[PDB]
């Protein structure tokens, strides 16, 4: 759960990231209008600078790939751009075509999302005007234009067969564009089949998955919750709204002795006492890394705050219906990563490191662990 | 009050002006590796300003 590798793109701030079909190169869109190809075929943890595509002045807000030959990018000047990423070709790294979407009169036009549709050899694009446009790839020409959304279209996705195109954005609606009918397929015409209002706020991310036993259309956004639909039965199928918080990892503990409630969020620990509740103490920690876990001794005097980077121990003393905090110094804990931590008694603790090393500290006695067959 | 905040700010300062030379501190290698680099406020702010622009009338 730590950064294996931090690789600098050698360009402006990144806006979009995408991977090609063979999964050997990353295309990275930058603020300065540059697109950088990063080779990742070397191995895990290996990233290398491959090539920089021809430069332009508009921010590249989104990227897509046609196999491993072309890079399709939507820009902040209201234009869709196709670069050639074909190696062993004279046109390598060159801007083959430029396409301009209809521009808002009184506002800037941003092409937020672009995807490639292999079956129909088309590009689907959503812009800040709410329009979805289908472009012919070989000629780089507009085939259809739909004024579907009332606000920005932030994300696009398609099914496996490219029979359905799903769009979502600020207007909280998900639109389905269908080309399933044989007559539609022969004519190559999309139809605005239906739309659904499922989110209480903006939809920033949408993705689709299909297998012999799975059919998911997963969306999420500013509401901070997932919404799950079925691609094939999107119009009529049931949907599930996942809980905003599912506490698989607990951010709150309660101490039976002293009747204390302790919650930690974003490097900040608050302690409450209930007889009807009073905030006895608040702890502000310096490190940017968030608190992974906190453990309080059965007596409640010793509080241990564990982070992947470091582990810090604080002693709590009740004074004047408030807690006095003093940081006990333990170099081993400061240099120790803490994935899980639990108290044996008021003094002894068991700590599991991020590398799966279980050892006991008295306030290290390593504990043998059975090997696991790979 | 505000001085306590400014004194807190002065501690969290990784450069100092020694005349024409500005000495700057180098952070620990573990800090860079353990956690990804910070976001640039200007870039992310521009997107969020756009999505909450006046013309949307989100209210």
């Amino acid at each position: 759960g730590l950064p294996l590798r931090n690789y600098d793109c050698n360009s402006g701030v990144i806006w979009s990231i995408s991977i090609n079909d063979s999964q050997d190169k990353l295309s990275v869109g930058c603020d300065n209008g540059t697109v950088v190809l990063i080779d990742i075929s070397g191995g895990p943890g290996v990233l290398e600078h491959d090539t920089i595509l021809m430069r332009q002045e508009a921010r590249v807000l989104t990227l897509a790939w046609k196999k491993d030959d072309f890079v399709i990018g939507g820009c902040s000047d209201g234009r869709i751009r196709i670069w050639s990423a074909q190696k062993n070709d004279e046109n390598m790294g060159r801007l083959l075509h430029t396409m301009k979407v209809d521009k808002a009169k009184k506002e800037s036009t941003l092409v937020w999302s672009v995807i490639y549709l292999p079956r129909t050899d088309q590009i689907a694009s959503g812009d800040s005007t709410g329009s979805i446009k289908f472009w012919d790839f070989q000629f780089a020409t507009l085939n259809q234009s739909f004024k579907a959304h009332d606000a920005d279209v932030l994300c696009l996705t398609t099914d496996t067969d490219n029979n359905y195109v799903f769009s979502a954005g600020v207007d909280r609606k998900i639109f389905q564009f269908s080309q399933n009918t044989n007559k539609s397929q022969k004519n190559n015409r999309w139809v605005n089949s239906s739309n659904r209002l499922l989110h209480g706020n903006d939809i920033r991310a949408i993705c689709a998955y299909q297998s012999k036993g799975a059919d998911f259309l997963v969306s999420g956004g500013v509401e901070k919750t997932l919404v799950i639909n079925s691609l094939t039965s999107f119009s009529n199928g049931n949907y599930r709204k996942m809980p905003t918080v599912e506490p698989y990892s607990k951010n709150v503990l309660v101490n039976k002795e002293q009747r204390l409630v302790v919650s930690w969020s974003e490097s900040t620990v608050k302690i409450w006492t209930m007889g009807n509740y009073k905030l006895v103490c608040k702890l502000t920690l310096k490190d940017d890394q968030n608190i992974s876990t906190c453990s309080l001794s059965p007596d409640g005097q010793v509080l241990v705050v564990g982070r992947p980077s470091t582990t810090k121990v604080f002693h709590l003393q009740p004074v004047g219906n408030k807690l006095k905090v003093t940081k006990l110094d333990n170099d081993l804990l400061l240099r120790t990563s803490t994935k899980l931590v639990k108290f044996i008694d008021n003094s002894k603790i068991v700590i599991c490191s991020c590398e799966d090393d279980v050892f006991i500290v008295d306030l290290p006695q390593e504990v043998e662990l059975l090997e696991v067959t790979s | 009050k505000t001085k306590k905040r400014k004194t807190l700010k002065n501690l969290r300062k990784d450069s100092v002006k020694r005349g024409k030379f500005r000495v700057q501190l180098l952070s620990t290698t573990q800090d860079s590796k353990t956690l990804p680099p910070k976001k640039e406020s200007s870039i992310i702010r521009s997107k969020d300003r756009w999505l909450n622009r006046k013309a949307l009338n989100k209210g």
Partner: peptide, 14 residues
């Protein structure tokens, strides 16, 4: 809550 507030860096400074 400033009465009960605790800051680690201020403690570290003094």
């Amino acid at each position: 809550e400033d009465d009960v507030e605790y800051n680690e860096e201020l403690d570290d400074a003094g």
